[PDB]
Amino acid sequence: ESADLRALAKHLYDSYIKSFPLTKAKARAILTGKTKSPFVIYDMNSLMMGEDKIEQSKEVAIRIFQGCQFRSMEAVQEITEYAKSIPGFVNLDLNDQVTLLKYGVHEIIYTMLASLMNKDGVLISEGQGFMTREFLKSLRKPFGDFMEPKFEFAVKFNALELDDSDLAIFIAVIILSGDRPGLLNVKPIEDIQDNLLQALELQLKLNHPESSQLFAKLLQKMTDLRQIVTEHVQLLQVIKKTETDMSLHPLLQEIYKDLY
Amino acid sequence: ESADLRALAKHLYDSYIKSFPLTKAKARAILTGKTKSPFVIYDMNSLMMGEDKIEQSKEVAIRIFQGCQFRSMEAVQEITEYAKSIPGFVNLDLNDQVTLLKYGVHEIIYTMLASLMNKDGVLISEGQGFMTREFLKSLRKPFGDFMEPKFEFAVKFNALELDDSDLAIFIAVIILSGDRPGLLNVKPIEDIQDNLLQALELQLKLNHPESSQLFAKLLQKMTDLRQIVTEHVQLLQVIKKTETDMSLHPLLQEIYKDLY
Ligand SMILES: O=C(O)Cc1ccccc1Nc1c(Cl)cccc1Cl
Ligand SMILES: O=C(O)Cc1ccccc1Nc1c(Cl)cccc1Cl
Ligand SMILES: [Ca+2]
Numbered sequence: 001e002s003a004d005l006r007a008l009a010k011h012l013y014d015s016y017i018k019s020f021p022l023t024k025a026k027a028r029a030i031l032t033g034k035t036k037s038p039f040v041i042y043d044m045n046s047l048m049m050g051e052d053k054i055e056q057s058k059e060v061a062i063r064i065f066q067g068c069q070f071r072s073m074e075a076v077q078e079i080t081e082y083a084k085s086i087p088g089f090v091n092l093d094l095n096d097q098v099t100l101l102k103y104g105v106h107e108i109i110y111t112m113l114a115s116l117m118n119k120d121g122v123l124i125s126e127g128q129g130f131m132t133r134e135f136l137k138s139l140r141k142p143f144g145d146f147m148e149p150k151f152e153f154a155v156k157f158n159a160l161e162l163d164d165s166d167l168a169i170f171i172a173v174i175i176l177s178g179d180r181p182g183l184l185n186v187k188p189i190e191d192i193q194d195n196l197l198q199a200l201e202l203q204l205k206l207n208h209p210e211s212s213q214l215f216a217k218l219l220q221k222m223t224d225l226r227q228i229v230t231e232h233v234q235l236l237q238v239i240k241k242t243e244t245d246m247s248l249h250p251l252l253q254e255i256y257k258d259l260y
Numbered sequence: 261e262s263a264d265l266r267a268l269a270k271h272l273y274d275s276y277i278k279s280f281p282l283t284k285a286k287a288r289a290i291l292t293g294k295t296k297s298p299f300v301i302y303d304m305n306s307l308m309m310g311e312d313k314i315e316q317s318k319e320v321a322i323r324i325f326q327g328c329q330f331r332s333m334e335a336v337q338e339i340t341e342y343a344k345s346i347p348g349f350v351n352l353d354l355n356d357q358v359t360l361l362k363y364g365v366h367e368i369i370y371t372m373l374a375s376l377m378n379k380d381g382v383l384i385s386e387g388q389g390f391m392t393r394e395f396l397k398s399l400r401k402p403f404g405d406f407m408e409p410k411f412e413f414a415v416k417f418n419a420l421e422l423d424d425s426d427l428a429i430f431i432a433v434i435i436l437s438g439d440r441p442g443l444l445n446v447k448p449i450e451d452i453q454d455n456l457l458q459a460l461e462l463q464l465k466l467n468h469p470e471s472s473q474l475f476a477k478l479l480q481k482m483t484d485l486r487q488i489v490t491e492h493v494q495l496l497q498v499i500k501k502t503e504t505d506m507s508l509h510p511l512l513q514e515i516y517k518d519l520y
């Protein structure tokens with residue numbers, strides 16, 4: 001029923017707002033000067049000014065890649081806490097909850113990252129910096145490309161003009177993907193996802209009534225996100241196998257690993 | 261200088277207040293009826309009422325032990341975030357930061373747990389429940405004793421009448437313990453700890469002027485906390501080796517382990 005499907009959407013939106021302080025709405029207000037201004041990092045010189053202006057220094061490409069990777073592991077906390085807020089999720093087998101999050105989190109980071117991006121760059125530091133796409137592309141191989149697949153995805157994705165209320169539900173659908181390798185009980189995952197898919201269809205109808213077959217464009221984009229996490233995962237093996245000794249885990253992840 | 265030592269103490273107190281929402285002050289107000297009242301769990305019947313009144317059910321002793329263990333891994337987050345707030349900590353080698361937290365966190369949990377305890381029981385659920393000591397002792401072997409060393413430590417510890425401002429510093433001293441096995445650069449750990457020890461001595465002088473040699477009683481208690489984490493660690497091996505398949509890691513710890 002439409003009452004339920006809307007209350008669910010309203011519930012996910014509120015939890016999203018709770019879990020994720022920097023919203024697409026705010027990010028967009030910052031990117032367009034509706035708001036304060038972020039420090040622009042466009043060259044080595046401004047990177048150095050910038051990182052001063054908001055343990056170890058080692059060559060910049062590594063520091064940048066490392067920051068991205070830390071910010072991503074950092075983000076896992078807010079995403080995990082969001083996923084628990086999804087009706088029926090905390091009632092799945094724990095091994096399945098873990099698997100869903102294991103394969104989902106990068107897809108969600110890239111989705112939310114796009115809220116922070118425009119063809120020219122990306123907001124960092126809770127909106128306090130703006131790093132250009134060409135600056136990132138300027139980094140030496142293999143680092144000069146780690147962000148391009150994200151920018152390429154983001155520009156097409158952002159053309160859809162989704163707003164946080166649609167994203168709250170989109171992200172929930174991706175978490176609950178019953179085809180992750182290694183799942184124990186696929187059925188109750190697909191049940192929940194199909195309520196979620198129906199709340200999403202209704203959402204886009206009301207929210208994007210001049211955009212029929214928009215739901216199908218979004219379904220398309222979940223495929224586009226697998227391609228990106230696979231390129232990213234393969235790039236990471238290559239960096240691990242060619243660039244000795246960078247730390248890619250923030251403190252909390254290191255201690256949770258070690259207490260295990 | 262005394263200005264510095266006090267500003268440091270003031271800084272640690274504020275970070276403590278930030279990191280740790282349930283303070284000893286509040287806990288004590290609850291335990292004495294200064295405040296609302298917590299649900300008392302004193303028997304199986306009240307445990308069942310209680311756990312209703314605030315994925316799987318398996319025999320109660322395991323559910324209780326499991327909750328304690330989850331709450332402890334949960335607490336690691338707030339402690340980690342507290343430790344970063346300690347001047348010079350985030351400037352140590354990461355491997356050393358990790359080691360300090362690896363061996364420190366249980367000592368701190370037991371210290372802060374004592375803020376939640378009286379000879380008769382312990383507050384749980386952010387102060388919403390009160391589980392009796394005898395109820396915990398009633399659980400079948402080997403569970404009937406996992407909390408007694410904590411109660412025994414807590415009663416003696418609480419006799420010292422420390423208040424959150426002293427605890428803020430105490431906890432910082434324990435984190436920075438330069439004798440943890442496996443530390444790479446012990447020196448800069450002992451430097452920081454000795455500023456911390458001086459801020460603590462000054463703190464107790466001002467805060468407990470009728471209690472000379474109180475500092476030495478607290479130093480004594482860091483030894484008492486090693487004994488408890490060792491009994492706890494050995495009890496845990498025994499439970500792991502005798503009681504199949506309980507989950508002892510909350511979700512975030514499972515995903516951080518798996519993304520590693
Ligand atoms: O900095 C932030 O808060 C945004 C964010 C979130 C997830 C992943 C990366 C980033 N930012 C960011 C990026 Cl997108 C690339 C390189 C370095 C950094 Cl610090
Ligand atoms: O419940 C809480 O918030 C307090 C807390 C903190 C750390 C460790 C354990 C506990 N509580 C608690 C205890 Cl002390 C024993 C058994 C079960 C529980 Cl849920
Ligand atoms: Ca600098």
Ligand SMILES: [Ca+2]
Nearest residue numbers: 206207208209
């Ligand atoms: Ca619209």
Ligand SMILES: [Ca+2]
Nearest residue numbers: 308309311312
């Ligand atoms: Ca029940």
Ligand SMILES: [Ca+2]
Nearest residue numbers: 466467468469
């Ligand atoms: Ca006093």
